[PDB]
Subunit: 257 residues, 6 copies
């Protein structure tokens, strides 16, 4: 439920703003002067994406236009906040993803890019993709189709290509590629279905399925489809076992055979 | 020819300025204002390299001096733009690499650093190497010898050491290391020959040859030479097959055998 | 000794001012104007951790405060400079790590955040952790315990988690993850003992021991303990040989079998 | 009416985007993207009152808050635009004051500070007063009472003190001081009544009356009251004639005897 | 000749870089790097005009285009540098105006705005006028016609309106207004002829002639024409005497009779 | 007494930092984290004089070097704070000059420039003079000799030339020139003796004396010496009267005949 999240964040914003006098005016700015999650998200994205080419105030107008035309982006972000909080044991506050975690920021920046792309504003979407790549080291093509409840933990070196699909409740670590094959357009990127966990450094290549609740071991190179509820690992990857739960995204157990 | 790529780019820029109002001026300053590819390149490298330590306007003189001394660097950039357009299916416009792709920027920044290193301005070349590492997440030592028609797609994590060689028409993906062994000076990094494709996350270490037309599979760790027209894959890498084409850099087929 | 490293840095700085007119004032400000290593480290961290939120002038004051209270951090930095100079054949000068190398800058930033974390100022330590991840592409949790004589060569994509330990005289390359497992707090990150070399791309996951003088091969995924004076390689990693020396961190031999 | 001024501004903005490629995105961001005058005023004040201390994105929120609570400030701005357009023969367009003229920008910044001063937020009002003095070279104390239809032409070196009053339809040129006397609080600054024209460099000092339709000559130093419909000039100023019209602010005739 | 001033400047810059370490790089980038006065001017105007709205690197193209179209603007700047060096006793170096004096910067920024206005790029010229007003506190309308060998000493508060004319070898101090009357278009600002000196705070209003070799005393308010080789002073100004020299702009004698 | 001033400022800094959450981190930075007036002055000058050419951290080192070699500059600034507080009825807090008033800031910037000039660092002093002119619109040549207890109220358009002298306890308003004659070097600027008050827009030209406790009317052009305890006014200036007190700088009575 959306309002829960926002409330917690405000409480946390009070408790914390006393402690660091250095940060006081930063907390008031990012969390305390806003009345909904949407206002805060637009604030942080505006500051995060600001450039000489397009300053913060101009970006915030684009982002607010996107949130007004599609309020479900705000709800997706709330689910993404919850996913990081519940899955990442280094995060126990709802405020942390929104303030600090570049993976969370790159994810919400993609959503604006995606919206822009589906409305025909593709030149702007590509500009934002490549700026997010420079600034947060996450390169997600704005045509990719990404659900909600996604954790991009650490996030540096993530690549998601044009025709990729990432369904709800997926967990992805640093240096993961959902990448293409060939020199031609068309469907050529992975389909990552609900509940999948992808470990650090995994490279998944081509228009292949990674089925519901599968787990991909860290450092794996997946060139063939991976059935649902299965664990794949190695270079190249083979089936080595079965995950310990229904949705490995939720448990983040990195072990494989 | 240089002239075509440049004309194509100008055509694209006119269409782009008319369709996106937030970027009309950006497109005008970076592309429509200029009369040749050399002038557009110096503009984009200047801006993206810019730091408090060294501002855009100072960088631009350095870059222009380099292009006046060695205009083959502009012809090299033009081959690199064409490589990305023909080999990367996410790119349909000649202008995209020049405007947006950090791997293309890093590579043309390398060429400036290389020109400086060879002239004896090593201190400045090392500054820029490390500026490029922070700004574009590509670490290419300026003593490396890198040819043209090179694509660095996505590019985050790419490392290319001091003594590496990369010949013409090579394609390289994100998190590729062309890396060193040992604590000693002298040749210790790979020599990558023409037509080679290197998949994402591959690690190639030491003074070893990767022959013409070879393919290195994603996530591979290559410790021994790879014969021409051969496919290597695994940790550590073994010869597992032969590529489907004479120049796998052109085709970007990522598949390889068990 | 500090005095040695520092004298070498000043001599090199004098020569560099005559080598490159464009950077003479830069070498002056960063090196020639200072009386000791500590003052030049604080100057460098100030300008590199400078944000719109917190400016260079204010961060220097926090770094000076930490160096006064614990001057061993300055001596740790000096050992880190010597480590890069002696181990990295592309670095001959002592000034190079201090001026340019983002792995060296990230490692010293960590020490500031680790000090703040230990004094209970966690909001600021987590703020800096994530700043460093964005600016230098190194993500080190401040609660990690990292010794001295550490080289982080090239450095981009390094991730070190909350409960990791890195003892003295370790060499780590780009895209190395010292990473977690599970969704629970507790010991869950690697323990990297003295003398260990970790090759580019290695992923080491869970609360496991990499013992004295071990070598982890490039691209390897380590899920079980690695005994002392042993080479581990593969995905997943298994024992494949013995290092050619007692401290592979000092020799940087990437070969494995 | 607001609607008129605003429609004129948009029409001019459309033409300017085709006149100058270099500034097309600028005209778009500042004018074409907005739905009313109020939203464009807040955008302009944000980017012009932007500081390292307080960013554009945060100042816009304070300006929007003041315009919601008191929308007559927006209508005052519109009268100020018409005043410059009708009175200044070098300004034909309505967009020009809004885009470029520092006197116009300073005057609208004042209204924000004057509102803040009246709500008791004086630290912020004094902060902005001095920001405007530095950035636009206009020093207006926020407690001054300034009406609407005011032209501050060229504007550099204008000083208006704490207890000054400027009624509607006044024209003031560069280097005009509406200034104090003494070291004590209390009424000590001029009262400038409706229709008055003040020439370049005039110094008007103390709690004195410059009555309806008076003209103050350039370079004059006014120490005693000036009766309505009278011309004052000299150092010190004495009465020298009568203005050629009932509202010299509207005619801008600099001649005196 | 242009060549001398430029050589003199380069000589000065070498000495300056060796003596002040905090500014060695500044001096190198702004002066020692360049091979002619035109290139140094475009560099300094670019940097000082720079705004979030328009960055240095974009300004510099505009400026260079102007100097390529009309290189007399560089010869004009060189006469202005010489005017400041010979007439301002606080300035002994040819480099000081170019580096530091905001009145010299404002004036060369005007020349760019004037070139743009005359070409039909009026919107950009008005942008720059107002950028210069905020950054250097000098408001000079770009339709004004201003010659060369002009000194604007200190310069804060200077206002020059749309229809003003300033001929060669004129010296002007801070808070001088060459100002308008009325709400109507057409000539309404002063025409200042050759050799005129205008003291600090003088206000000169309307379409009136100030003749060759005249002197306008500090703090004066001039409402009627001033004959050649005459001294005007007062509020309002009266003819009070004759200047000590044929060209008071050269001598900068501020004295005038009761 | 110096410590008084500093104390008051800290008390004021607490009382005020509660009120404006926007400014909280700015107050902590400018006033609360410093233990003496010298540290605060160096902070504010560093931020105020920062440029791409010479960032804040580098400037602060120059300024601290100057304050260590000559601590009387810090005391002069304290007397300048007191002068503004006691003479300007719009200022009643000791913090206001230090935080906000560009006249105060330009004065203390001159002192650094003066120190630099007397040590042979003239190229740097001239760079700072011209930056202060651009940034605060006060142009003071660093060779001028300026005492303590000086008020530069409003300050925009002030010019003080190379050979000028300003003794202790002088009050100067906006647009005042202490200016030169001729094209030759040598003594050619005014000598302004103790207690003088100079009104807005006054132009004082040549190597002439303005005697102890004299008053110069606003808008006056002074080309001849002005005896002690005398009032001069007009264009050109003549003796018109005698000031109402011993030191007109203290009372700020702008009236003249």
């Amino acid at each position: 439920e959306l309002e829960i999240v926002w409330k917690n964040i405000k409480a946390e914003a009070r408790a914390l703003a006393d402690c660091e006098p250095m940060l006081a005016s930063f907390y008031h700015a990012t969390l305390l002067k806003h009345e909904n999650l949407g206002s805060a998200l637009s604030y942080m994205l505006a500051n995060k994406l600001a450039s000489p080419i397009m300053p913060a105030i101009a970006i915030r107008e684009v982002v607010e236009e996107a949130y007004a035309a599609d309020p479900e982006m705000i709800a997706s972000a709330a689910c993404d906040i919850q996913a990081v909080r519940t899955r990442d044991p280094a995060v126990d506050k709802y405020s942390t993803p929104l303030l600090y975690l570049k993976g969370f920021h790159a994810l919400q920046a993609y959503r604006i890019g995606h919206w822009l792309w589906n409305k025909g504003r593709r030149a702007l979407a590509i500009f934002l993709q490549n700026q997010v790549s420079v600034s947060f080291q996450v390169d997600i093509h704005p045509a990719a189709k990404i659900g909600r409840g996604i954790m991009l933990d650490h996030a540096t070196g993530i690549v998601v290509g044009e025709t990729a699909v990432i369904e709800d409740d997926v967990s992805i670590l640093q240096s993961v590629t959902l990448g293409g094959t060939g020199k031609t357009s068309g469907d050529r990127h992975p389909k990552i279905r609900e509940g999948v966990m992808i470990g650090a450094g995994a490279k998944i290549l081509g228009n292949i399925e990674v089925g519901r609740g599968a787990k991909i071991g860290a450092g794996s190179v997946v060139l063939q489809p991976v059935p649902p509820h299965t664990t794949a690992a190695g270079v190249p990857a083979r089936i080595v076992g079965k995950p310990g739960s229904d949705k490995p995204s939720m448990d983040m157990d990195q072990h494989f055979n």
